Design a protein around this motif. Structure first.
Motif, PDB file in Angstrom:
ATOM      1  N   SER A  60       0.826  -1.203   0.000  1.00  0.00           N
ATOM      2  CA  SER A  60       0.000   0.000   0.000  1.00  0.00           C
ATOM      3  C   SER A  60       0.862   1.255   0.000  1.00  0.00           C
ATOM      4  CB  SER A  60      -0.939  -0.012   1.207  1.00  0.00           C
ATOM      5  N   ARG A  61       2.042   1.176   0.610  1.00  0.00           N
ATOM      6  CA  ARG A  61       2.953   2.312   0.630  1.00  0.00           C
ATOM      7  C   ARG A  61       3.570   2.504  -0.748  1.00  0.00           C
ATOM      8  N   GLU A  62       2.752   2.911  -1.717  1.00  0.00           N
ATOM      9  CA  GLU A  62       3.215   3.129  -3.080  1.00  0.00           C
ATOM     10  C   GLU A  62       2.738   4.485  -3.578  1.00  0.00           C
ATOM     11  N   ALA A  63       1.669   5.001  -2.970  1.00  0.00           N
ATOM     12  CA  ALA A  63       1.168   6.317  -3.343  1.00  0.00           C
ATOM     13  C   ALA A  63       2.127   7.411  -2.893  1.00  0.00           C
ATOM     14  CB  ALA A  63      -0.221   6.536  -2.745  1.00  0.00           C
ATOM     15  N   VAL A  64       2.792   7.200  -1.761  1.00  0.00           N
ATOM     16  CA  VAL A  64       3.713   8.186  -1.208  1.00  0.00           C
ATOM     17  C   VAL A  64       5.116   7.814  -1.676  1.00  0.00           C
ATOM     18  CG1 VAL A  64       4.463   9.323   0.947  1.00  0.00           C
ATOM     19  CG2 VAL A  64       2.135   8.413   0.734  1.00  0.00           C
ATOM     20  N   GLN A  65       5.209   6.745  -2.466  1.00  0.00           N
ATOM     21  CA  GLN A  65       6.494   6.288  -2.980  1.00  0.00           C
ATOM     22  C   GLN A  65       6.920   7.131  -4.175  1.00  0.00           C
ATOM     23  N   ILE A  66       7.960   6.693  -4.883  1.00  0.00           N
ATOM     24  CA  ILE A  66       8.477   7.444  -6.020  1.00  0.00           C
ATOM     25  C   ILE A  66       7.452   7.413  -7.143  1.00  0.00           C
ATOM     26  N   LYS A  67       6.773   8.539  -7.358  1.00  0.00           N
ATOM     27  CA  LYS A  67       5.751   8.649  -8.398  1.00  0.00           C
ATOM     28  C   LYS A  67       6.408   9.209  -9.656  1.00  0.00           C
ATOM     29  N   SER A  68       7.067   8.322 -10.394  1.00  0.00           N
ATOM     30  CA  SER A  68       7.751   8.700 -11.622  1.00  0.00           C
ATOM     31  C   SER A  68       7.847   7.471 -12.517  1.00  0.00           C
ATOM     32  CB  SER A  68       9.133   9.290 -11.326  1.00  0.00           C
ATOM     33  N   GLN A  69       7.566   7.677 -13.806  1.00  0.00           N
ATOM     34  CA  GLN A  69       7.690   6.653 -14.839  1.00  0.00           C
ATOM     35  C   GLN A  69       6.708   5.505 -14.634  1.00  0.00           C
ATOM     36  N   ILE A  70       5.877   5.592 -13.604  1.00  0.00           N
ATOM     37  CA  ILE A  70       4.879   4.567 -13.311  1.00  0.00           C
ATOM     38  C   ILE A  70       3.723   5.231 -12.569  1.00  0.00           C
ATOM     39  N   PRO A  71       2.768   5.842 -13.266  1.00  0.00           N
ATOM     40  CA  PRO A  71       1.574   6.366 -12.596  1.00  0.00           C
ATOM     41  C   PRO A  71       0.573   5.256 -12.328  1.00  0.00           C
ATOM     42  CG  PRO A  71       2.054   7.481 -14.706  1.00  0.00           C
ATOM     43  CD  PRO A  71       2.794   6.194 -14.691  1.00  0.00           C
ATOM     44  N   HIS A  72      -0.079   5.334 -11.171  1.00  0.00           N
ATOM     45  CA  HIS A  72      -0.940   4.247 -10.733  1.00  0.00           C
ATOM     46  C   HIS A  72      -1.912   4.729  -9.667  1.00  0.00           C
ATOM     47  CE1 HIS A  72       1.454   3.921  -7.023  1.00  0.00           C
ATOM     48  NE2 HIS A  72       2.502   4.080  -7.810  1.00  0.00           N
ATOM     49  N   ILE A  73      -3.160   4.274  -9.773  1.00  0.00           N
ATOM     50  CA  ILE A  73      -4.157   4.561  -8.751  1.00  0.00           C
ATOM     51  C   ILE A  73      -4.173   3.438  -7.719  1.00  0.00           C
ATOM     52  CG2 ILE A  73      -5.478   5.784 -10.498  1.00  0.00           C
ATOM     53  CD1 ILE A  73      -7.590   3.492 -10.190  1.00  0.00           C
TER      54      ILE A  73
ATOM     55  N   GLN B  70       2.691  13.606 -13.866  1.00  0.00           N
ATOM     56  CA  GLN B  70       3.869  13.047 -14.504  1.00  0.00           C
ATOM     57  C   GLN B  70       3.574  12.718 -15.966  1.00  0.00           C
ATOM     58  N   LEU B  71       4.615  12.338 -16.698  1.00  0.00           N
ATOM     59  CA  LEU B  71       4.501  11.970 -18.101  1.00  0.00           C
ATOM     60  C   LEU B  71       5.766  11.225 -18.488  1.00  0.00           C
ATOM     61  N   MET B  72       5.635  10.342 -19.475  1.00  0.00           N
ATOM     62  CA  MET B  72       6.768   9.531 -19.901  1.00  0.00           C
ATOM     63  C   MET B  72       6.648   9.154 -21.370  1.00  0.00           C
ATOM     64  N   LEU B  73       7.564   9.662 -22.190  1.00  0.00           N
ATOM     65  CA  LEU B  73       7.612   9.324 -23.609  1.00  0.00           C
ATOM     66  C   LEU B  73       8.543   8.133 -23.779  1.00  0.00           C
ATOM     67  N   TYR B  74       7.992   7.013 -24.246  1.00  0.00           N
ATOM     68  CA  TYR B  74       8.771   5.808 -24.499  1.00  0.00           C
ATOM     69  C   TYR B  74       9.925   6.121 -25.441  1.00  0.00           C
ATOM     70  CZ  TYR B  74       9.800   0.915 -25.695  1.00  0.00           C
ATOM     71  OH  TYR B  74      10.414  -0.300 -25.895  1.00  0.00           O
ATOM     72  N   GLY B  75      11.154   5.929 -24.975  1.00  0.00           N
ATOM     73  CA  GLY B  75      12.307   6.339 -25.749  1.00  0.00           C
ATOM     74  C   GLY B  75      13.534   6.619 -24.911  1.00  0.00           C
ATOM     75  N   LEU B  76      14.077   7.825 -25.027  1.00  0.00           N
ATOM     76  CA  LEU B  76      15.369   8.156 -24.438  1.00  0.00           C
ATOM     77  C   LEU B  76      15.278   9.552 -23.829  1.00  0.00           C
ATOM     78  N   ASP B  77      16.443  10.140 -23.547  1.00  0.00           N
ATOM     79  CA  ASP B  77      16.601  11.458 -22.938  1.00  0.00           C
ATOM     80  C   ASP B  77      15.987  11.505 -21.544  1.00  0.00           C
ATOM     81  N   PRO B  78      16.551  10.789 -20.576  1.00  0.00           N
ATOM     82  CA  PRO B  78      16.060  10.883 -19.200  1.00  0.00           C
ATOM     83  C   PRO B  78      16.683  12.073 -18.482  1.00  0.00           C
ATOM     84  CG  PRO B  78      17.792   9.257 -19.295  1.00  0.00           C
ATOM     85  CD  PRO B  78      17.696   9.866 -20.682  1.00  0.00           C
ATOM     86  N   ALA B  79      16.103  12.393 -17.323  1.00  0.00           N
ATOM     87  CA  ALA B  79      16.545  13.502 -16.481  1.00  0.00           C
ATOM     88  C   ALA B  79      16.439  14.836 -17.212  1.00  0.00           C
ATOM     89  CB  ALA B  79      17.977  13.275 -15.989  1.00  0.00           C
TER      90      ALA B  79
END
Lengths: 100, 87
Positions: A60-73, B70-79
């Protein structure tokens, strides 16, 4: 009670409710007809359900986790997530105690 | 729009919260889609979608617990997309 861990990679699902998680037939499991101490079976089942409680509390501790490259409800008992728009998520659990 | 999927109370505390944040996120997504269309798109159930070419790429979603969607374009150029996120 008793618990069950199940994951399903379906297509998708909105914020809706239906005949989803285990019904009155909660977690069909081995009858365990082989002779063993029944009290010990209840004890290990309690240990198992506490383990499920702990792993769900950690997950459950995922909403306050790193919210990047993986958005999730995430809601109670439902952690439905979309890593790629092909698979599904939200491993679930139940309490097989409310059935006389 | 009648408190979608959580019009009635007494179900769960989290229900009304997720309802509200989802409605407001969809509102903000439609607002973004508005300016996108006025410049020169479509949307979905979780969040909006915007193409970049005329054929797949450049997916953007919303943080259901805070701002800075947030947003993420499948590919390259991170950070580097992080600067776009901040902007």
């Amino acid at each position: 009670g008793s618990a069950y861990i199940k994951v399903s990679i379906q297509k998708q699902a909105p914020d809706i409710g239906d005949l989803g998680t285990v019904n009155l037939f909660k977690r069909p499991l081995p009858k365990s007809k082989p002779g063993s101490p029944h009290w010990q079976t209840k004890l290990e089942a309690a240990q198992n359900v506490l383990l499920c409680k702990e792993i769900f509390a950690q997950l459950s501790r995922e909403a306050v986790q790193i919210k990047s490259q993986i958005p999730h409800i995430v809601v109670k008992n439902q952690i439905i997530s979309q890593p790629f728009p092909s698979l599904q998520l939200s491993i679930s659990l139940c309490h097989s105690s409310d059935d006389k | 729009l009648v408190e979608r999927a959580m019009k009635i109370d007494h179900l769960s505390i989290e229900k009304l919260l997720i309802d509200s944040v989802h409605a407001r996120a969809h509102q903000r997504l439609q607002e973004l889609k508005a300016i996108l269309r006025s410049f020169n798109i479509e949307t979905a159930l979780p969040a909006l979608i915007v193409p970049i070419l005329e054929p797949e790429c450049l997916h953007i979603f919303v943080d259901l617990h805070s701002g800075m969607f947030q947003l993420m374009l499948y590919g390259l150029d991170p950070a580097t997309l992080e600067d776009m996120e901040k902007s």
